[PDB]
Amino acid sequence: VNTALQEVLKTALIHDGLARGIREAAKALDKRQAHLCVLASNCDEPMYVKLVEALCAEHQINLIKVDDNKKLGEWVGLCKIDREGKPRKVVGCSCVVVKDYGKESQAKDVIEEYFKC
Amino acid sequence: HRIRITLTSRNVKSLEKVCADLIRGAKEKNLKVKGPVRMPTKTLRITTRKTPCGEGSKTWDRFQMRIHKRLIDLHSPSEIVKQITSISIEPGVEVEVTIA
Amino acid sequence: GHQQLYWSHPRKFGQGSRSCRVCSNRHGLIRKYGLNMCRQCFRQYAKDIGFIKLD
Amino acid sequence: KSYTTPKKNKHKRKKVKLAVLKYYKVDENGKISRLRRECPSDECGAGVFMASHFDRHYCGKCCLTYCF
Amino acid sequence: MLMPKKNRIAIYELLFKEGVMVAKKDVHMPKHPELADKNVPNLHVMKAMQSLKSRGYVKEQFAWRHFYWYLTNEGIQYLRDYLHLPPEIVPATLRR
Which residues are reported to carry the modification Phosphoserine (chain B)? Predict the structure, then answer.
């Protein structure tokens, strides 16, 4: 779920398993080093959603849909400046790929129950 | 049992004191001990200009550092040498244990 | 090729190969007995090496 | 200050705007094609792509030229 | 100052293991003498350490050519919440 995705993004921040963006994420996809993927459709996205769907849906890649790109910019580890209260500005990244090692958490079981149904 | 122990120091007095201490320890040990072999003294000479400038009278100063070396031969194994040389050593002297 | 041109000049020898231990100066170096100091700072720190002046 | 010779410059390199997505020619069917080749070098990864020109191909990190 | 992130996190772990850091004031060393396992120069180490000094984390000692950097308490705290480490391991300075 959403809190499980937030906790596994915090785990990726706490043990640097973040493949954020499209370039190194596509390199990890082509290098068979992709475990979990998140996608953000229904935005200003005429054909970019078609390109990211064609690149992601290749070899058993599952997605979690996010309504807005700025909603996931608080905990991914990107806009980590000016931590006195709210951050200075939140920007949106499209797709985040998680490559964590510490799988002894219930959030992994929650997201695997989401995927396996 | 032909061992040769070198003893080098900056000082002469403490060198002779620790040499006489080891000699009287070997004599109280009732062991055949050789005398001290006074090596020739090597002198390190440095002459340089006293001033940092090029101005003034051409005056030079002389620096010395004498080196004194002593030799002791003994007829005991290494543990007796260790137990006689590991106690009450001068801070200026240094040792080197060899076997031949 | 900046990474191979910044240090393209060899420094195996010459005056720039030597450097003072205390002030990184190329002038007035002593190489006797492996000291590698300038003359002024050797005069300043002459006492604690063991070099005494009695001639 | 100023000088009689004109001032020099820094090569502010031109930016890309979804350029590699213009090389990922994927149509509505199940056909995934790449307009630029996969890099034959084994010392690099599997995502770097060579530079495509009208008379030669230039590597990204391996610095190997595929010239006709 | 542009650098890879591997050498910076390496010298941060070197700060975490022992609270001392020694570098020589010359950019003409391709390798740190005790960091021959990694490809790190000396200019990156010096500029990162003086960046920590400017932010207010390390102290400075210099006589002839070597640097001697200490680890302050706020510097240790910044190390602790930057390396994402569990806050229970103590360095060798406090431990006897």
Answer: 76
Q: Cβ of A67 under 8 Å from any chain E Cβ?
A: no
**Beta strand A96-98 pairing with B37-38:** unpaired
Those residues with Cβ within 8 angstroms of residue A23's Cβ, 6 or more apart along the chain or in another chain: D47
Rg (Cα) of chain D, in Å, rounded?
18
User: CA distances (Å), D36 to each of A57, B100, D23, D49, D53, in order?
Assistant: 20, 76, 7, 7, 11
D-contacting residues of A 38-57, CB under 8 Å? 48, 51, 54-55
SS3 B69: strand
What lies within 8 Å, CB to CB, of E54 at 6+ separation is none
CA-based nearest distance B85→chain C, Å: 25
Q: Give, in order, the Cα–Cα distances in Å from B49 to each of B53, C18, C25, C37, C53.
A: 9, 21, 17, 14, 14
**Min distance C54 CA to chain E CA atoms (Å):** 29
**Identity of the amino acid at C43:** R
d(CA A73, CA A90): 6
Which 3-42 residues of chain C touch chain B by CB within 8 A? Answer: 30, 32-33, 39-40, 42
Inform me whether the C-beta atom of residue E2 falls under 8 Å from chain C C-beta atoms: no
Answer whether E57's CB lies under 8 Å from E75's CB: yes
Distances (CA, A) of E75 to A13, A41, A98, E19, E86: 21, 42, 30, 10, 16
Question: Are B97 and B32 within 8 A, CB to CB?
Answer: no
How far is Cα A111 from Cα A60, in angstroms, rounded to an integer? 15
Neighbours of D50 (CB within 10 A): 20
Ramachandran angles phi, psi of C5, nearest 5°: -105, -20
Residue B77's H or E segment, with its range, is none
CA atoms of C44 and C51, how far apart (whole Å): 11
Question: What is the domain count for chain A?
Answer: 1
CA A99/CA A103 separation, integer angstroms:
10
Entry resolution (Å): 3.7
Dist. CA A75–CA A91, nearest whole Å: 12
Q: Does E30 touch chain C (CB under 8 A)?
A: no
